[PDB]
């Protein structure tokens, strides 16, 4: 950092290394639980609401 | 009745008649619940609480 009125921050990163500069790690991927059941609480058993 | 000593209540029973003291009465056996399915409301909305 130098001068006054600090500017936005670019970044220089290598890509050759198989272990990249950052990493997003997850236990599970996307998972969905659409409750399209007649006994679901909010679709017929609490309201007319599908979730 | 004892003026001073009141330690406990040792109980004596004949337990030999047609009936016994403190007879137990049951309507139906014990039931057990596992609200673990994704369709359960709380385990999808109550910070993923299953009971």
Method: cryo-EM
Record: contact A39-B39, CB cut-off 8 A? yes
Smallest Cα distance from B42 to chain A, Å:
10
Q: Are B28 and B38 in contact (CB under 8 A)?
A: no
B39 interface with A at CB cutoff 8 Å: yes
Cα torsion A35, A41, A47, A49 to 10°: value is -10
SS (H, E, C) B33-50: CCCCCCCCHHHHHCCCCC
Residue for token pair 């009745």: B1
B41 interface with A at CB cutoff 8 Å: yes
- Let me know if A33 is exposed, middle or buried by CB neighbors in 10 A (0-12, 13-18, 19+): exposed
Record: contact A37-B41, CB cut-off 8 A? no
């Amino acid at each position: 950092a130098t001068t006054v009125s600090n500017l936005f921050a670019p970044a220089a990163d290598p890509g050759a290394a198989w272990y990249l500069l950052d990493t997003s790690r997850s236990l599970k991927p996307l998972i969905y639980q659409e409750r399209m059941k007649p006994s679901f609480t909010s679709m017929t058993k609490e309201d007319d609401e599908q979730v």
